[PDB]
C-alpha cells in the first residue's frame, strides 16, 4: 500500500525560508519520478517540478527562478521542498506526488505554508442586529483575526437550520475577516435568544455574542 | 510556457447529463495529456492520461479524446459524486502547466436571492472602523452582481465578498459584501445602500438605510 | 545504464511476416515511449509508430498502418513490431528508439537495429571475373589488379589474395544489388615488377553455397 | 506529406562552430513539430542529441545545443571535436507522424585532404561470353568522404545502367566507393571510348579506356 506524508508547513516570514518532506511508504522513491504541486487558498493547480530517479536531474518552472530545491534521501525513503525568499504568493498547500507514465498516481495529505509577518490575534465580534415577510436574518461578524481558523456555532449548537458561515478572506492588513448568519422567524425576535459562539484557538479567544434588535 | 485554456470555467449539470469540458494548448501538445478531478480540501485524482486512456480503477463513465492542441473529457452519465472541479495537465513542455479548471456544480430553478442590509454596531463605530454587510441568501444560479452606493456614489475597491458552497439540501448559494470604512470616512455620507442584480429579479433589488437614524 | 537489446537479423521471401523484439532493459518500461524506425539502404530513416508501453497504446505512420503492428509485453519489458506481407520493398534494418516525455522530449536511446532482408532469390554462388588494366603501358611503379565477384546470393563472400600472402593494399568494397543478386569487388595494388612475371590470384567464397573459386589474373 | 531537408555533407575543424540545418517544407519550422536531432556514428550507432527544439538530452556534451533560427530548426556545435564527426538526423513531428530529413555527414577535419585515387576497369572476355559486360571503377583514399561519379561514353553523358556505393572508411580512415556501368556486350562493342569521373571537393578526377 503506496502513502506519502507530508511535514513541515506552517507559519513563515516573508523572505524566510521552508523546509517541507515528504516520508513514502510501500515503495522506494529512489525508483520513482517525484513531483511538487502546490495550490493557494482558493486558486488553482501549480507544478513546482520533480525529480529524475534515473540520473538525480531536477527540473523546476522558471517561475522559480532557483529558489526552489527539490532533493532525496533513500535511506529515509524521503523527497524533500525548499523554498527560499518566501513572498505571499507561496502562501499554499502544497502535495508531493508520485509519478508513472508522467500522471500522478500517489499524492500526500498536503502541507499547508503561510506566508506572512502578521501577528496572531483574537477577533472582535461584532453583532448583525435584524432590521425589525415572516422571516429576518441576523448574525455576526468576526473580524481582524489571525491566523485561521475560527469556528462559528450559534445558540452551543441548538440552531444549525438556515445558518450560513462564509469563507474568511484576508484583508490587505494581514488579518481575517468573516460572517456567519442566520434567517429565523420575524416572530420570535424577543421571545427567542440567538447568541453566535466564536471560538479562535491560537489566541484563546472564546466569545459569546447576543445578538439582538 | 505553454498556456492551457479549459472551457467553460463552471458548468451545471443534472445527474444522468452527459458533460464535456475541453482543454485548449497554444501549441501541440503531443497528447502528453492528463485529467484530474479535485473535491474541496482534498488532493486532486487521475482520471485520464495520455489524452485518452482510462487510469486504473477510474470509472468507465469518464473518457478522454483529441489530440493536437484540442482535447476533451467526457462525463457519459454524472452521477452525484461527479460533482467537484476539474483540470487539465499538459506535460508536452517543462514546465508542466494546469488548466484553470471547470467546476462542474448542480443545476436547480432559477432562485432569487433575498436581500438583507447590516449598519455598523454602535460596539464597532466606538474603536474607529465600520463595517457595513449586504446579505444575498439562498440564490441560484451563482453569478450575483452586487454594486454599494454611498448617496447614491458608486463604490469601488472597499468592499470584499464570500461565497458558500451549493448548500446541500437546496442547491443554493448565499454570498455576502462587506464595505470597510473608518469611522471618519462613514461619517462623511447618510445614505448607504447595496443593489443586487441577478437573473431571479425583473429588475435590480436595492436595500439602502439612513446613517445612524 | 539504459539498453535496448533488438533480435537478429531475418532472411524471407515475400509474403512472409516477420516479427521483431527490442528488450528494454536499465530504467521503467512504462515511462518513455518506444518508436519503431525503418532504415532503408544504409541511409534514410522513416518512422513508422509508436507505442506508449503503459497500455500500448499506438499511433501508426499512415504509411504503414497495414504493414506493421506495434506490440509491447510488460512482464518482460520488450516492444514488438510484426511486419506482414513482405515484399523486396521492406528489406531495411528496423530501430527501436526510446523517447521522452517529461523534459526532453528526445529519441534517446536506440536499439542496434535489426536487419530484415525479403528476396525470393535461391542461393546462387557468384561468377568471378579479372579485372584487368589496359589503358597502355605502365603510368607507375604501381598497378591495380580486381575481380568482378558477380551476381550472388545471400550475401556474403569473402576474398583474399594470392591465398593471404598479399595484404597490403587490398580493398574489398560494399555490394550492390543488381536484379535481385548481389554483386562487388576486390582490388590488389602490386608493383608493376610484380606482374604478370609473378601471378596474382583471386580467393573468392560463398559460404552459403560452399563454393570457393580462383581467378587468375592475366593481360588483356 | 512534407519534405525535411538538411544539408548533403558539411566539413569543420576542430575547435570550429558549425551549425546544421533543418528544413520544413509546409512552413517555417515551430516548437510544434518538436524539432529532435539524432546522431548516427559509425558501425550504425544512433544517440538523441537534443529534443523538444532545444533540449539537449542527458549525458550530451553542452557544446551541443539546438534552436530555431529564421523558420528552420537547428543544431550548433560550439568547438566541434574530433569524437562528433558522424551523420546527423534532423525529424520534424506533425500533429500524428514524424519525418526525418535526410541528414548530415559531418566531418571534423582530422588529417589532410586526400584526392581519389581512380582506376577503371574494362569487361573481361570471359562476362563478355555472357552477352554483358560490365565496367568497374574503383575510388580509394580520398578525404573527406564524399564524391560525386558520373560516366562518359564517346564524349556524351550516360544517364542510365550506372551505380554507385555510398563511401564507406578504410583502415587509414580515408574514404573508398565503386561504381559500375552495366552494359550489353553489343553496346560495349559499339562504342569506343569509356570514362569514370569522380569528382571531389570540386576538382574532376578521371579515367578512360579504349
Known amino acids: 500500500e503506496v502513502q506519502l506524508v507530508e511535514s513541515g508547513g506552517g507559519l513563515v516570514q516573508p523572505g524566510g525560508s521552508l523546509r517541507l518532506s515528504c516520508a513514502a511508504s510501500g515503495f522506494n522513491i529512489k525508483e520513482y519520478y517525484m513531483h511538487w504541486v502546490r495550490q493557494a487558498p482558493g486558486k488553482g493547480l501549480e507544478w513546482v517540478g520533480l525529480i529524475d530517479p534515473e540520473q538525480g536531474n531536477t527540473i523546476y518552472d522558471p517561475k522559480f527562478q532557483d529558489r526552489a530545491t527539490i532533493s532525496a534521501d533513500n535511506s529515509k525513503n524521503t523527497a524533500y521542498l525548499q523554498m527560499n525568499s518566501l513572498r505571499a504568493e507561496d502562501t499554499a498547500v502544497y502535495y508531493c506526488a508520485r509519478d508513472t507514465a508522467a500522471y500522478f498516481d500517489y499524492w500526500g495529505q498536503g502541507t499547508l505554508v503561510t506566508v506572512s509577518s502578521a501577528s496572531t490575534k483574537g477577533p472582535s465580534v461584532f453583532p448583525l442586529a435584524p432590521s425589525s415577510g415572516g422571516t429576518a436574518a441576523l448574525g455576526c461578524l468576526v473580524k481582524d483575526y489571525f491566523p485561521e481558523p475560527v469556528t462559528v456555532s450559534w445558540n452551543s449548537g441548538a440552531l444549525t437550520s438556515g445558518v450560513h458561515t462564509f469563507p474568511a478572506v484576508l484583508q490587505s492588513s494581514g488579518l481575517y475577516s468573516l460572517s456567519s448568519v442566520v434567517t429565523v422567524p420575524s416572530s420570535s425576535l424577543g421571545t427567542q435568544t440567538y447568541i453566535c459562539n466564536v471560538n479562535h484557538k491560537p489566541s484563546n479567544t472564546k466569545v459569546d455574542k447576543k445578538v439582538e434588535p | 510556457d505553454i498556456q492551457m485554456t479549459q472551457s467553460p470555467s463552471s458548468l451545471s449539470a443534472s445527474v444522468g447529463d452527459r458533460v464535456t469540458i475541453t482543454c485548449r494548448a497554444s501549441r501541440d501538445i503531443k497528447s502528453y495529456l492528463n485529467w484530474y478531478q479535485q473535491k474541496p480540501g482534498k488532493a486532486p485524482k487521475v482520471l485520464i492520461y495520455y489524452a485518452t486512456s482510462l487510469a486504473e480503477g477510474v470509472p468507465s463513465r469518464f473518457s478522454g479524446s483529441g489530440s493536437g492542441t484540442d482535447y476533451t473529457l467526457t462525463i457519459s452519465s454524472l452521477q452525484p459524486e461527479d460533482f467537484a472541479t476539474y483540470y487539465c495537465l499538459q506535460h508536452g513542455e517543462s514546465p508542466w502547466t494546469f488548466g484553470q479548471g471547470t467546476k462542474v456544480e448542480i443545476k436547480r430553478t432559477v432562485a432569487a436571492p433575498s436581500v438583507f442590509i447590516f449598519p455598523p454596531s454602535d460596539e464597532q463605530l466606538k474603536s474607529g472602523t465600520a463595517s457595513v454587510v449586504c446579505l444575498l441568501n439562498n440564490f441560484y444560479p451563482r453569478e450575483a452582481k452586487v454594486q454599494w452606493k454611498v448617496d447614491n456614489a458608486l463604490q469601488s475597491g472597499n468592499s470584499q465578498e464570500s461565497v458558500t458552497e451549493q448548500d446541500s439540501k437546496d442547491s443554493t448559494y448565499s454570498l455576502s459584501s462587506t464595505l470597510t470604512l473608518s469611522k471618519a470616512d462613514y461619517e462623511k455620507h447618510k445614505v448607504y445602500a447595496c443593489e443586487v442584480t441577478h437573473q431571479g429579479l425583473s429588475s435590480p433589488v436595492t436595500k439602502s438605510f439612513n446613517r445612524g437614524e | 545504464e539504459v539498453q535496448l537489446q533488438q533480435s537478429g537479423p531475418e532472411l524471407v521471401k515475400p509474403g512472409a511476416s516477420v516479427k521483431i523484439s527490442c528488450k528494454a532493459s536499465g530504467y521503467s518500461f512504462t515511462g518513455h515511449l518506444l518508436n519503431w524506425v525503418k532504415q532503408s539502404h544504409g541511409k534514410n530513416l522513416e518512422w513508422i509508430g509508436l507505442v506508449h508501453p503503459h497500455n500500448g497504446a499506438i499511433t501508426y505512420n499512415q504509411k504503414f498502418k497495414d504493414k506493421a503492428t506495434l506490440t509491447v509485453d510488460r512482464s518482460s519489458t520488450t516492444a514488438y513490431i510484426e511486419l506482414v506481407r513482405l515484399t523486396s520493398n521492406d528489406s531495411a534494418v528496423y530501430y527501436c528508439?526510446?523517447?521522452?516525455?517529461?523534459?526532453?522530449?528526445?529519441?534517446?536511446?536506440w536499439g542496434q537495429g535489426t536487419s530484415v532482408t525479403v528476396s525470393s532469390a535461391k542461393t546462387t554462388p557468384p561468377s568471378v571475373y579479372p579485372l584487368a588494366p589496359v589503358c597502355g603501358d605502365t603510368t607507375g611503379s604501381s598497378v591495380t589488379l580486381g575481380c568482378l565477384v558477380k551476381g550472388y546470393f545471400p550475401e556474403p563472400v569473402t576474398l583474399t589474395w594470392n591465398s593471404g600472402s598479399l595484404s597490403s593494399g587490398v580493398h574489398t568494397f560494399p555490394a550492390v544489388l543488381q536484379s535481385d543478386l548481389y554483386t562487388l569487388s576486390s582490388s590488389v595494388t602490386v608493383t608493376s615488377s610484380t606482374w604478370p612475371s609473378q601471378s596474382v590470384t583471386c580467393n573468392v567464397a560463398h559460404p552459403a553455397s560452399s563454393t570457393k573459386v580462383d581467378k587468375k589474373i592475366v593481360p588483356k | 506529406q512534407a519534405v525535411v531537408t538538411q544539408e548533403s555533407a558539411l566539413t569543420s575543424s576542430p575547435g570550429e562552430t558549425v551549425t546544421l540545418t533543418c528544413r520544413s517544407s509546409t512552413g517555417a519550422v515551430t516548437t510544434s513539430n518538436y524539432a529532435n536531432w539524432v546522431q548516427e556514428k559509425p558501425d550504425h550507432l544512433f544517440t538523441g542529441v537534443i529534443g523538444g527544439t532545444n533540449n539537449r538530452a542527458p549525458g550530451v556534451p553542452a557544446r551541443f545545443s539546438g534552436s530555431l533560427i529564421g523558420d528552420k530548426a537547428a543544431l550548433t556545435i560550439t568547438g566541434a571535436q574530433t569524437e562528433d564527426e558522424a551523420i546527423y538526423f534532423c525529424?520534424?513531428?506533425?500533429?500524428?507522424?514524424?519525418?526525418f530529413g535526410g541528414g548530415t555527414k559531418l566531418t571534423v577535419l582530422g588529417q589532410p585532404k586526400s584526392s581519389p585515387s581512380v582506376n577503371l576497369f574494362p569487361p573481361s572476355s570471359e562476362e563478355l561470353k555472357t552477352k554483358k559486360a560490365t565496367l568497374v571503377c574503383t575510388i580509394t583514399e580520398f578525404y573527406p568522404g564524399a564524391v560525386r561519379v558520373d560516366w562518359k561514353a564517346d564524349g556524351t553523358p550516360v544517364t542510365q545502367g550506372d551505380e554507385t556505393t555510398q563511401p564507406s572508411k578504410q583502415s587509414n580512415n580515408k574514404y573508398m566507393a565503386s561504381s559500375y556501368l552495366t552494359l550489353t556486350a553489343e553496346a560495349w562493342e559499339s562504342h569506343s571510348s569509356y570514362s569514370c569521373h569522380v569528382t571531389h571537393e570540386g576538382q574532376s578526377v578521371e579515367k578512360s579506356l579504349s
Open positions: 528508439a526510446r523517447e521522452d516525455f517529461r523534459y526532453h522530449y528526445s529519441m534517446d536511446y
Open positions: 525529424a520534424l513531428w506533425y500533429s500524428n507522424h514524424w519525418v
